[PDB]
């Protein structure tokens, strides 16, 4: 665990994310101008809550599938025992999706990428969960303020998954050793990119799963 050793891991995780990001940043950023029309928004609003759940759950599960593939090609993750792998994914994958979602959020007009175009939070009125949606938009807004780089998401979301303090882990030391190397990679990269400032500005680790309440 020296200089090139850790830099191998940085590049290792950044490749792993690049290959499992589902939606390209270049796509999301260009698509920002393509906003839903008032007709289309009403169109979405008239739908049943059930059709909105179905649509939403589809894409979100699909997202979780991509997060698993990211987890699978993190070195060390496969060496963990069956039980420990699933514990980490059960407590992490939704938190990872939530972070990854900030790339799909235009902070200028307060809109999100959903089914082809960008819409505001009034788009999901059918769900009747305005409280939860606001907080999701809030959380995305603050992470947009930091201008999160692709590599930074890659590294941070690796650290979201690989947590030694998850309840019900058999080989805690095996996870510990893994979490530690990823912290080193994360901290080394921020140092290397003059981006240490963001550490202090990241949401606390009990704020991610405070949103997963009526979930
Ligand atoms: C990087 O993480 C993301 C970000 C957005 C989306 C996804 C994954 C999955 C595909 N998707 C789609 O809309 C489906 C589709 C794919 C494509 O090429 N074109 O369209 C988006 C998405 O699901 N957005 C959405 C935004 C708010 C919500 C909340 C209701 C939680 C606010 C939500 F459930 C989903």
CATH number for the domain formed by residue range(s) 1-215: 1.10.565.10
Task: From 17, 19, 23, 116, give the residue whose CB has the most ligand 1 atoms within 8 Å, as the site to mutate.
Answer: 23
Experimental technique: X-ray
Query: Could you tell me the two tokens for 58?
Result: 């589809």
Q: Do the beta carbons of residue 12 and residue 77 sit within 8 Å?
A: no
Q: What is the resolution of this structure in A?
A: 3.2
User: In the beta sheet, which residues pair with residue 111?
Assistant: 106
| 119 phi/psi in degrees, rounded to 5 | -135, 155
DSSP per-residue codes, the chain: --HHHHHHHHHHHHHHHHTS-SS-HHHHHHHTT-BPPHHHHHHHHHS-HHHHHHHHHHHHHHHHHHHHHHHHTSTTTTTS-HHHHHHHHHHHHHHHHHHHGGGGEETTTTEEEETTEEE-GGGGGGG--HHHHHHHHHHHHHHHHTT--HHHHHHHHHHHH--TT-TT-S-HHHHHHHHHHHHHHHHHHHHHTT-TTHHHHSPPTTTSSSS-S--
Pocket of ligand 1 contains residue 105 by CB under 6 Å: no
- Are 36 and 119 contacting, i.e. CB atoms less than 8 angstroms apart? yes
Question: Cα–Cα distance between 155 and 160 in angstroms, integer?
Answer: 9
Ligand 1 pocket check for 110: Cβ under 6 Å:
no
Collect all residues with Cβ–Cβ distance below 8 Å to 209 and sequence separation of at least 6: 91, 95
Phi, psi values for residue 153, rounded to 5°: -60, -55
Ligand 1 binding pocket includes 136 (Cβ within 6 Å): yes
Say if ligand 1 is within 6 A of residue 63 CB: yes
Q: How many C-beta atoms surround the C-beta of residue 132 within 10 A?
A: 16
């Amino acid at each position: 665990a020296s200089l090139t050793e850790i830099e191998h891991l940085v590049q290792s995780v950044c490749k792993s994310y690049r290959e499992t990001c589902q939606l390209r940043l270049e796509d999301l950023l260009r698509q920002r101008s393509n906003i839903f029309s008032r007709e289309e928004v009403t169109g979405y609003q008239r739908k049943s809550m059930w059709e909105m759940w179905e649509r939403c759950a589809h894409h979100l599960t699909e997202a979780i599938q991509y997060v698993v593939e990211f987890a699978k090609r993190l070195s060390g993750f496969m060496e963990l025992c069956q039980n420990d792998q699933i514990v980490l994914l059960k407590a992490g994958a939704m938190e990872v999706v939530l972070v990854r979602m900030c790339r799909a959020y235009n902070a200028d007009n307060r809109t999100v990428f959903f089914e082809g175009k960008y819409g505001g939070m009034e788009l999901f009125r059918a769900l009747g969960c305005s409280e939860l949606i606001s907080s999701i938009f809030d959380f995305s807004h603050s992470l947009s303020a930091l201008h999160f780089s692709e590599d930074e998401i890659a590294l941070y979301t690796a650290l979201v998954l690989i947590n030694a303090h998850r309840p019900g882990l058999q080989e805690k030391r095996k996870v510990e050793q893994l979490q530690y190397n990823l912290e080193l990679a994360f901290h080394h990269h921020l140092c290397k990119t003059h981006r240490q400032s963001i550490l202090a500005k990241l949401p606390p680790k009990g704020k991610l799963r405070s949103l997963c309440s009526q979930h």
